[PDB]
Enzyme design. Structure first.
Site, PDB file in Angstrom:
ATOM      1  CB  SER A 206      -1.101  -0.034   1.099  1.00 23.16           C
ATOM      2  OG  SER A 206      -2.036   1.054   0.927  1.00 23.16           O
ATOM      3  CG  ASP A 577       2.753 -17.545 -33.489  1.00 26.64           C
ATOM      4  OD1 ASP A 577       3.960 -17.478 -33.270  1.00 26.64           O
ATOM      5  OD2 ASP A 577       2.260 -17.075 -34.509  1.00 26.64           O
ATOM      6  CG  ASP A 588      15.523 -32.084 -39.328  1.00 29.71           C
ATOM      7  OD1 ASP A 588      15.079 -32.659 -40.322  1.00 29.71           O
ATOM      8  OD2 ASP A 588      16.499 -32.530 -38.687  1.00 29.71           O
TER       9      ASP A 588
END
Ligand SMILES: [Ca+2]
Ligand SMILES: [Ca+2]
Ligand SMILES: [Ca+2]
Ligand SMILES: [Ca+2]
Ligand SMILES: [Ca+2]
Ligand SMILES: [Ca+2]
Ligand SMILES: [Ca+2]
Ligand SMILES: [Ca+2]
Ligand SMILES: [Ca+2]
Ligand SMILES: [Ca+2]
Ligand SMILES: [Ca+2]
Ligand SMILES: [Pt+2]
Ligand SMILES: [Zn+2]
Ligand SMILES: [Zn+2]
Length: 616
Positions: A206, A577, A588
């Site tokens: 706070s 993504d 690959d």
């Protein structure tokens, strides 16, 4: 992890966070203990008294006990014992060589006109031989003279306080003005014990959180720069420092948290102020009775409306965010992960589903983490990807779709599918994982769920209509002598196995070790598990599922109609993504998720579509 700090690892950042929380709670000496206990037993029917707001802002004199704010008579000893349990002991004025005032509790007070009611705790952590190893600085900030908090309506008072933090660097300079001399004593004390600034932890909540940010802002230039490399974790601060040193943690629905932009008052300060901030955790929801309530939310969300302060109270900070720390999903999270913390009263917990309502907040992004209580919870996940954690208690889960992980925890737990058992496929690896696949292909990985509830529009096998409870067993889902069989599978061992699918398609469960999974012309579901698994499609529309520390896998024969599913894996930021995890290595494509990887053998990265690579 959501509380990752600087370059500390996941684990060291957690230990720092837990200490910060502990000294932060200590600094309030159980101010909100009785209120929190009342809330827990009865709910929030009666709202929040303005006297609690004024106490939080202005402090108390003392001790007890204060209208209407129930007072736990053991507040003091409870609070001291708790902080001691976390490893900390208040350091004495004599030990510091501090000539100034401390009270009966050992609390230090502010030094200059305007600050003289501000408080700080100076605590030490010691090794088993009694050598000081760490210093903890917990600010309990105050707004100024207590007497000013009731000269206008509470809304006007709050509004004026907020507007006064920015001008003339009031917020920035606060700790310099309040505790400049004390902090010099702390430097000398630290050096006398062989500690440096890296060994100091600074926290508070706070206005105490405002003080954390202040000290950080001042640390480059004051006290010889000794504190420049100290650790700053601020809870529920209205302000953010200009430095990159402060981890500003808070509940999204806490109207104090992030009320100011830096220290600047804006058009959002008295409204919803949920714009992303680099230093802050932006998407942690306190799912409490207020948040859940239609009635309570009739009025526009505002710091000026005192009921909203329910979400600012320190007990629910410590309880709720400790459950985040303990979560089995913790290492999947990051600073701005959407995390919904079950913070309902006992009465509300009985009939309220904990869910992401997205109330009074910007639209949430990425996967959603929903953390339960140690009692019986009703937990509802959304139609996106969810990680649902029941903890103890008999928990009931619902979920709206997508790819999900559901951890029942202790207790007798239930998954309520809300639809017919006929629309779902079930598999089981024999290693405590029950997989549930919906009609759209979304997959739930579940543990410790003993019962499945379905809603049957017709008489399932000519016997049971409406709501039907099935038992989860090694052989299927059982209703008396009726069984809904698991999908065809081939199960390995915790060593290196070769498993072959049948032409009809199988779930292939390699479990631990480096497995050789030989799919067939059917639609297979490959779960390599731990280890470095070689997984061959063999034709069909195949699914490859990756969870946890899944290793360095090779996938052979992947085509457009196949799918990769990454669910509960490392390194996933909200809304990542596959391109964020993909690279080409010769012929690959390689997908990396923390230290784990999948190599798509002989697949060009440019041939891939996001629809075939689910990243949850
Ligand atoms: Ca942020
Ligand atoms: Ca948010
Ligand atoms: Ca979901
Ligand atoms: Ca629970
Ligand atoms: Ca449970
Ligand atoms: Ca194996
Ligand atoms: Ca394996
Ligand atoms: Ca097959
Ligand atoms: Ca296949
Ligand atoms: Ca295929
Ligand atoms: Ca693997
Ligand atoms: Pt599910
Ligand atoms: Zn030692
Ligand atoms: Zn092979």
């Amino acid at each position: 992890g959501v509380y990752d700090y600087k370059n500390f690892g996941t684990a060291d950042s957690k230990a720092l966070f837990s200490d910060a929380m502990a000294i932060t709670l200590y600094s309030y000496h159980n101010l909100d203990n009785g209120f929190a206990a009342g809330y827990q037993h009865n709910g929030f029917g009666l709202g929040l008294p303005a006297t609690l707001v004024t106490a939080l802002l202005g402090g108390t004199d003392s001790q007890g006990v204060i209208p209407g704010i129930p007072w736990n008579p053991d507040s003091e000893k409870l609070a001291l014992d708790a902080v001691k349990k976390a490893g900390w002991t208040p350091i004495t004025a004599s030990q510091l060589g501090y000539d100034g005032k401390t009270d009966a509790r050992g609390t230090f007070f502010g030094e200059k006109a305007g600050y003289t009611t501000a408080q700080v705790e100076i605590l030490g952590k010691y090794d088993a031989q009694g050598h000081l190893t760490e210093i903890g600085i917990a600010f309990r900030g105050t707004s100024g003279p207590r007497e000013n908090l009731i000269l206008d309506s509470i809304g006007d008072v709050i509004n004026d306080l907020l507007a006064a933090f920015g001008p003339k660097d009031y917020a920035k300079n606060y700790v310099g003005e309040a505790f400049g001399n004390l902090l010099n004593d702390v430097v000398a004390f630290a050096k006398a014990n062989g500690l440096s600034g890296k060994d100091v932890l600074v926290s508070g909540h706070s206005l105490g959180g405002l003080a954390v940010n202040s000290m950080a802002d001042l640390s480059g230039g004051k006290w010889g720069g000794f504190f420049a490399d100290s650790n700053y974790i601020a809870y529920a601060s209205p302000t953010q420092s200009s430095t990159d040193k402060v981890l500003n943690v808070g509940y999204e629905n806490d109207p104090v948290f992030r009320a100011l932009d830096g220290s600047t008052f804006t058009g959002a300060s008295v409204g919803v102020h949920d714009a992303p901030k680099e230093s802050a955790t932006d998407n942690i929801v306190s799912f409490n009775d207020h948040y859940a309530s239609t009635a309570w939310n009739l009025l526009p969300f505002s710091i000026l409306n005192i009921p909203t302060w329910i979400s600012h109270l320190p007990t629910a900070y410590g309880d709720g965010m400790n459950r985040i720390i303990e979560s089995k999903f913790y290492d999947l999270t990051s600073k701005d992960s959407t995390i919904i913390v079950a913070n309902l009263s006992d009465p509300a917990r009985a009939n309220t589903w904990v869910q992401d309502l997205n109330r009074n907040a910007e639209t949430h992004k990425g996967s959603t983490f929903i953390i339960g209580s140690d009692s019986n919870d009703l937990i509802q996940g959304g139609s996106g990807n969810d990680y649902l954690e029941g903890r103890a208690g008999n928990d009931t889960f619902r979920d709206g779709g997508g790819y999900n992980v559901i951890l029942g925890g202790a207790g007798n737990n239930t998954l309520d599918l809300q639809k017919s058992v006929n629309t779902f496929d079930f598999a089981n690896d024999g290693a405590g994982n029950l997989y549930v696949r919906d009609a759209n292909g979304g997959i739930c990985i579940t543990r410790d769920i003993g019962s499945i509830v379905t809603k049957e529009p017709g008489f399932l096998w000519g016997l049971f209509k409406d709501d039907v409870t099935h038992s989860v067993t090694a052989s299927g889902l059982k209703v008396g002598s009726n069984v809904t069989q698991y999908d065809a599978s081939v199960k390995g061992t915790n060593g290196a196995d070769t498993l072959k699918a049948h032409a009809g398609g199988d779930w292939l469960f390699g479990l631990d070790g480096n497995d050789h999974l030989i799919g067939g012309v059917g639609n297979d579901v490959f779960v390599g598990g731990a280890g470095n698994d070689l997984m061959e499609s063999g034709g069909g529309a195949d699914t490859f599922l990756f969870n946890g520390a899944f290793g360095q896998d090779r996938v052979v024969g992947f085509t457009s109609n196949d799918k990769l599913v990454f669910l509960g894996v490392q390194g996933v930021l909200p809304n990542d993504d596959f391109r964020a995890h993909a690279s080409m290595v010769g012929q690959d494509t390689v997908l990396k998720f923390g230290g784990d990887s999948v190599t798509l053998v002989g697949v060009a990265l440019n041939s891939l579509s996001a629809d075939g690579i689910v990243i949850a």
